[PDB]
Structures are given as structure tokens and as C-alpha cells.
Amino acid sequence: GMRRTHYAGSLRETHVGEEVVLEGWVNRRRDLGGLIFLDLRDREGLVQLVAHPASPAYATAERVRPEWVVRAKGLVRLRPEPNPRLATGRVEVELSALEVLAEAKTPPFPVDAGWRGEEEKEASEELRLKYRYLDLRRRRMQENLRLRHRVIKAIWDFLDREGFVQVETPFLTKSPEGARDFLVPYRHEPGLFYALPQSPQLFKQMLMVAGLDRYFQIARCFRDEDLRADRQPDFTQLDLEMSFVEVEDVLELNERLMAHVFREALGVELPLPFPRLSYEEAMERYGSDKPDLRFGLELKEVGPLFRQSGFRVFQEAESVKALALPKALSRKEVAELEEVAKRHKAQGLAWARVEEGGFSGGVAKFLEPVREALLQATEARPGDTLLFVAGPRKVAATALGAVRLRAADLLGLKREGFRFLWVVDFPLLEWDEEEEAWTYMHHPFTSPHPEDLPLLEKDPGRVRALAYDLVLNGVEVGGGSIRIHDPRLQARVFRLLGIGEEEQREKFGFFLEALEYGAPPHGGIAWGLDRLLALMTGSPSIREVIAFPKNKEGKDPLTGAPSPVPEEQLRELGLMVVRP
């Protein structure tokens, strides 16, 4: 068997007196009165080795430097004084033998602090990526990757128990989730390409046409986007699909799955069921379709209070939303929130102060005439600051919701734990304020609400979709919908989305043909697994939970990708780079 008798970090006082064989890295060396103390490290943590001048191990111990790899043999003994910061801190290994398995030069940044329970100083992330195989030696990074393992295994255990079949779907496939495709040139016929899948969407629906009833996959997705907002060129989804389901069936299975994952991998109990908010409810109350429920400060509609007001900017607005903050803001901070508001298309931010009887600052003058109704509507107390955005309903909600989020940081609100929620009853179409156009919030295979089918031709903007988003702590961690299984309806919805019969055949003809062979009712969802793991670990970026990620420009400092290829190779593909 193995030479190793134990993981180094697993030794305890119950092993005192045993002879052990250990293998690991030298976390740190210190010399004292002729003794050589080596902190030996493996994935279970540190244990102290002691090399005595009279031991045969001593000559070898004198050569050793940090990050060298050694095999050590000796007797577990109690330390005269224990180190309470270490799990092995009561014991040490009295070395009888020591062998160097590998030498090492000094690393470009330290990896030893976290194994001692000490705080790690911030290193340059471009350097950590360039030497990612050293960065991954740190305890925090190994914890992240081992949590990732435990989450996926929990997912397999639960979905296997629920009868889901794991199916691996293609990577070299047909050239659809609202991004650009990554292409792969076909070598034998220049001008031909594969595309990497933006998601397995069409394949998992075909697996329902095939009668497998329920599917899942830990799927890699590839999307060529502006990597703004911590995007990686490829990323991981828990993808799943079910047959003969309504929305509620998908929502309940996912809730139970999430509670299982959090229980088994984090030791956290998630109360069930998750809260549910409709799209309109979410934006009315929070000004966001990804509400952060870790704090209050809900938005209130006060437009109907100003229909007789001399303040034309309020009186003409479709909506005036208000938010009461429990603090008297400085003029600098107010201007900061005003800038946030203006960055979200608002015409501006109004403000005032609540005092014992009257109001002070900003627009207080125009607030005095409606004081009684306003205080009942906002629940504001003396010392608060009231903020207002006036305008069209979606802008006013969205602008003051972003002010709300920013203000939680300014006020230092303690936001704790994991607050999941479903957002449901999305409209089928979203209005692009900029491009003056209708676009789909979810992909084109999302089923409209069956009660709304006659509105597809009469009034498309009132049409509800059978779609849903899963939100965690103000972050979208999942999204899905019930699908269209009638080929007539899917073409009808394609026509509505501005897709003629020619484009339908060229992009989706194979899938529309599949719908004519008896497609069952089906629906599904996909989680953003990297996003979820980042939240579960409190990481600032999904790069902390991916073993070998790209940097922010989608480049790989570790390997040098992306890079040129030999001119010979590029000519074999029958392509050339166009001259600027």
C-alpha cells in the first residue's frame, strides 16, 4: 500500500506514541538551539516535525527550505507547550528519518499563512493567475474547490434519488441565449464551423421528446459576451429538464434540491418554501427583478398624492416612488445617491429631512402640504431622509431601487445569511428603453401563459410567460420556464419575435420538426453554479471558485492563451486574418 500512514494535518493527541510516515510540503522552517522545526503541510493541514542533532534525520533536515516536498518518519509526542491555533497543535513528530522528494525555489507570493490560521495579505490577482498552481496551495482556495466538489456530489445524490438521468450533450454543435457564439472551424471544408453551446437548451428539450422524462447535467456553457460584470467566457450550469410539469412542480423540486445542497455541503438549513414574488411585485416593492431581501427599505408609490401639487415634475410623472432611510444624510452622500439615480436613467433625486414636527432640506417645502398622508405611506420617523424619483413606472422603480442598494452600503447595514426567492410571472416581452423595441426576457422556447394566447396577436405586451428566476441575495442564480411543445404555437411565437419562416428553418428547423412527433409538456431550469458557489463562500468573484479561470479580459496568464498559431496551421483551415 501507500508509505503514508496518515495525512499530516490529521494527527491528534490520540496518536501519541505511534510511529507514523508522513508526506507533504514544508510550510515553514525554524531553527532553535540546534533543533530544526519543520511545519509539514498537506491538504488536511499542518503538523510540527522535530529534527534533533542526534537523529539520522538531521543531516537531511538541514538542507530543507520552504515548499520542499519530504517524506518523514517518527514518533508522535506531545509538545511541551501546545499551539492552540492548530488542529494538530498538541502534538509533534520526533523525526527518526527524513527524505527529500523534491526541492523548490521561493514562491512569488506566500501560501503558508492560511494553514496557520493567520490572515493572508492580498496578492495581485494577475500574479495569482499566472502561478495558479501555487495560488491553489492556499487553504482558502482548496476549501473553495472542495466545497465545489461537495455541492456537485450532493446534486448527483439528490437528483439520482429523484429519478433524473444525467445525459452529456454535445460541445461541437449547431451555430442561443442572448450572446455571440464561439466558433470552431471545420478543417475539411473551409467556410464550415461548429459552434460551442451557449447552453444545452435544445438538446434537453429533445431528451423530453425522446421520453427520458427527467434529465440533468453539470453543463459547460460558452458565451462570447462583453465580459463586463465578472463574466467568464465559459461557465458552469446545473441544467435540468422535466416532463409533464407545471411551474409549481419545477419550483418545488428545485427548492428541495437547494435545501439539500446547503444542508449537506454548508451545514445550513434553508427554510422552505422560498418566498415568491411576481415580476411586477418585485419591481414595485424593490425596483429590481433580483431583489435583495437581506434588508428592508421597500419602495412606496406616492404618485397619487401629487395630482393637485404645484410641483410639475411630480405632478406630470406616471409614478413617483419614495424610500425612507433611517439616517440624516450629509449633502455629499445625497449627491452620491443622486448620481447613482441619474446613472439609472432617472431625471434626478429629491431629498428632505424628517424632524419632530416639520421637514427640512431639499424639497421639504413641497412635502409640507401632504405631510399626514406621506408619513402614513412611508412610516418615516424623525431623523430620516426621504428620497424620490419621478417618472415612468419602470424607470422610477429601477432608479430608486439602485439608490436603495447603494444606500445599504453607505449606511453599513448588516446583511447576513442566504435569502432565496423566486421571481415568477415574467412578461413574455421586455421593453428596451434605448433601442425602442420589444425583446424577449427569456429565450424563444418559453411558453406564453395559455390564458394569454389570443393576446399574442391582439396585445403582445400584456402576454405573461411561464418563466421564473431564482434569486439569492440580490443575484440571479437560476432561470427557467415551461416550454412550448406545440409546433404551431412555437412558430407563432417565432413570428411574434420577428423571425420569419426562412430564419426558423435555418436556425431551428430540426427542433421544430421534432415538435411534430409527439412532444410532451415539459419545463426546466438552469443554475449558475459558479455564481452560487461564489455566494456560498462569500467570494467577490467567480474566479475564486474556478480552478483555472480566465482574467477579466478572458485571457489565461498561466498558459498564454489565447495566442497565435503557426501560419501553416491557419492555412490548413482555409482561413486568413483580414488586413486592417
Added chain:
Amino acid sequence: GMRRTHYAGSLRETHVGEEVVLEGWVNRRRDLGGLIFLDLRDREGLVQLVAHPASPAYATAERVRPEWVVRAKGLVRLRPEPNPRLATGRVEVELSALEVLAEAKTPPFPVDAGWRGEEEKEASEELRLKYRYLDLRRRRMQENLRLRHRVIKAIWDFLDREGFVQVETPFLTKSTPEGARDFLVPYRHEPGLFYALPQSPQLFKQMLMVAGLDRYFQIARCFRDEDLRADRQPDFTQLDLEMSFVEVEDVLELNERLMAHVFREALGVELPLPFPRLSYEEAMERYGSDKPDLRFGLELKEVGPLFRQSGFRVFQEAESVKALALPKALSRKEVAELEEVAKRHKAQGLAWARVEEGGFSGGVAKFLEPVREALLQATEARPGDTLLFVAGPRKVAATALGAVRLRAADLLGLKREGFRFLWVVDFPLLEWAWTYMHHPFTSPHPEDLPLLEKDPGRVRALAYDLVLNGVEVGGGSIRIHDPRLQARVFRLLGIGEEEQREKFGFFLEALEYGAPPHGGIAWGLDRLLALMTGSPSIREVIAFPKNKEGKDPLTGAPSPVPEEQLRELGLMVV
């Protein structure tokens, strides 16, 4: 909750008297005696629905057609006589309600017969792939896909219990001009730059050992743009794993126990442990192949040193004479077929003779009588057998008679059953300049290190192949962890410093920061599943594979893109 109360195929006599709600596809319809029989299908199998004339569902049941999707409601009853070919065969459902959820076109081929336990006529595979979502309705295809699920879950269970960490590695990585051709991905923001899809996770998994994770695995997709002949797909799946502080023995032992766990859990088959082991040299000598089929015997025997004084010059002067004893007197037709198999494998010919009770007859029988007692003790041949001989260079004679041995198995109608695994070990590190076999990180055998510069062709590697029924299903090695030894192997290969950096620079630098001893392996998961299912191609164990030519008839890929999509990438077709 769900509308259905049960999977259609899960109903048994224990459900008699319950009212059920079922959803599925119409497998077939038959009218007999005024009753309408509908075989309702879902993934657990078929159940008979019966519509009686008085029933509200009677008119609906008469109009439904194959592959329509329906919801049925009724009472579970015993059949008057059971159909034992169905798991639900003791029961049927008396319909009270029947609702059509989707109509269906007549499929281009039948998918109904397997679910009744009947043989299925072979359909054009190109037609099956074009309508793959329909092909996957067949019972056979769903069993393959569900077996694949059970194998992967069993791998996760076992390796998780043994302390392995699953780690996902990059799909967009560095293109290298190293050997097999990469599939490329253009980098939009800087035309002329490309990512490559990974040929394997090799460098990432070794770096994970340098990172101290101790033991890793991944169900990994590999992409290799090479010749697709011999049932290859442009991408395929490996079970990929790596371990620290191991010797060859530690890797083989782990993989043996893992494989036995997989077969027990996913197939209900017991694999005796340990697996047999043969060195590469023993495998070549006894079977003429580095992937021996152990499902039958008929071992090759070296008889060269028997004819060093025989008059038969072609035997007497050959470097090697290999012999094989077949337990059947063959026809002159059969011998000439084996002879052509030998010549097709670079042999000069195939000598033969029959073994009689007192001596030999036919072919080269005359030159065999002087050495009869020794020839028979070496071949263990009995009267009635037929001796085949190939004389020539050692590797050629072995390889040719090994292929003769395989073709002979079919001629004799040998029963080849079950699952026969073995390890092939102690491969040579190199082969003639000099070149490595798989990748250049494989460790030399420690006791052969001084021969690296003196006698390189005799240096053994710490490399191993896993073979099942004559097929390579896995390969790996102990890796080099000493950078000075890795540079030493590169100097032996003539691979300069500028070429090392351009091809492995980031990994060779990683070795300078303390790499532990480590080693690993990868299984060909598709290949293993095809063997586990008796499928003739890995296409049968992949949900949506390419055809034999590498194209996808289902979606039409690879396909052109609009010129604007390609111009945005800064590339053009020449």
C-alpha cells in the same frame, strides 16, 4: 403535485384496485372483440389500457394513433391471462378517461418493438442520427443512456469515498503545435489569436498535484481533430484521475477496485480481483498484441530454437518462429484465409501442418518430424490439431500470428463471453531518432535510469494500459516530478530549450516549485460503455454523437455562418 400517480411501466399486481393517472406515448393500438387496446409507454415500460364500449374514453381511444402523447385515467385490473414479456404483464388499466396532449406524425422508423420485448429491425444509422430524438425513444437506447448514468454515479460514489476531489479544468486553453491537431476557437477581440479545446486534462491534473490536492478526478471531455476512422468521435469522454505519493501498484490497485465497484453497481457483474498483469514483452510473446483478448486461449509459442539444425532454411535462419495449435483440422480454404491475414500483417507467409496420432501431415510436415517430441511438448498439441507457423523478425512474427490467432477464433466458433480485464505494464519508454509513446512526462523505471543514455531502447517506463476483451480502455503512468530528470529526458529526445518553453514552459516552471511524486490514468468512458453493452460502436452509448464522418445529421453542423458573423471575428475564407 404531479398529475400522474405512477410511471406507466411501474404498475404491477400490487396496484390492482387503485385508480391511477398515467401520461405517456401510444406505443400501438389494436381493436379486438369490440375492445380497444392501447399500449401506453413511458421510460419504465409499457402498460395495457383497455377502452370498453360504454366508457367515456371509447371514441377518443379509437382516434388515437402511434406516438401520440396522452393522459389516461382508469382502474388497475388483473388481465385474464398475463403477458410475461411485459413487467406490467399481469395487469391492465380499464379506461375511464383519455385525453390527447399532442398528436404525432408517423415516425420514419419504428420505436415500439423493443418495449414489447421483440427484436428490432436494423435501421439506417444515418436515418437514426437525423431523427436521434426519435431513435432515443427505443428501449435499447434508453438502457444504454441510463447505464451510463449509473456508471458515472458509481464512479463519483467510490472516488468520493476514497478521498478524491472532482475538479473541472479549462475548455478554452493554449494551442500547442504538439502532435495531434487542436480544434481552434477564434478570439474575437484580437483577430489572429485562438484558444484551443483540450486534448486531455493532463497538464492541469498534474498541476493539481503540484497544488497539493493529493487526488483528483474528472469526467472529462477531450477534443482531438484527427482521423475519425476506427470508430472515433471528434470529442469523447474520459474518466481522468491523478494521485500523489503513489507507485504503479497504488494506481493499479485503486483502479481495479473502482472498476469492480462500477461493474457490481451498474451491471450486477462480479469481477474477480486482482486483474491479471502482463508486461508488454510477455503480452507480445504470448498473444502478439499489447491488447490481448483473454476470452480464449490459443497462446503463441516461440519455437525458433527448435529448428536451428533443421534443413528447412526459412525456419532455421529466422530470428523468431512463432507457432500456434488450433483444436480443429482446418480446410485448405481456412488455412489460406489465415495465411492472407498473416501476410496482411507484414509476414512473409504462414506455414502449416496437421497433427496426426503418430506424426504430422501436410504443409511443412516433413521438416517437423525430426523435432516431433520437442515440438509437441512446446505446443502441447494433440492429434487432430493444426499447427500454424510464422517465421521472421520477432515483432513481425508475433504481431502477425497474433492477428492470425484472432481471426482463427472466429473460424473455430469459439464462445467468447464475459469481461476479461488485464493490465499491460512495463512498456518501453521510447521507440526509434528517439520518440516517446504517449506524452513526455512519463517516468522511466528507476532501476533503468542509467540506461537512459547508454541503451535507451531498453529503458522501461512506469506506464500501464488497461485492456478489456482485446480493447484498450485506459492508459496512464507515473509522472516525472524531478525537473532535472525531465530535462534529462528532453536532452535524450533532442528537444531543445526553446521548444520546451514554447510547448510546456508554464508546466516545466511549475516543477521548479516542488512537485510531489504523482501518477494517474484515464479511461475511455465511451469505449468502456460500448463494451459493457455489447454495442458495435461508441455511437450507441452517446446521446447525440456525430456520424462516422464527423458531421451531425441531426442539426446539420458543421454549417456556414453569415459573412457578418465571421467578419466580426476578423477572419475570412481564403
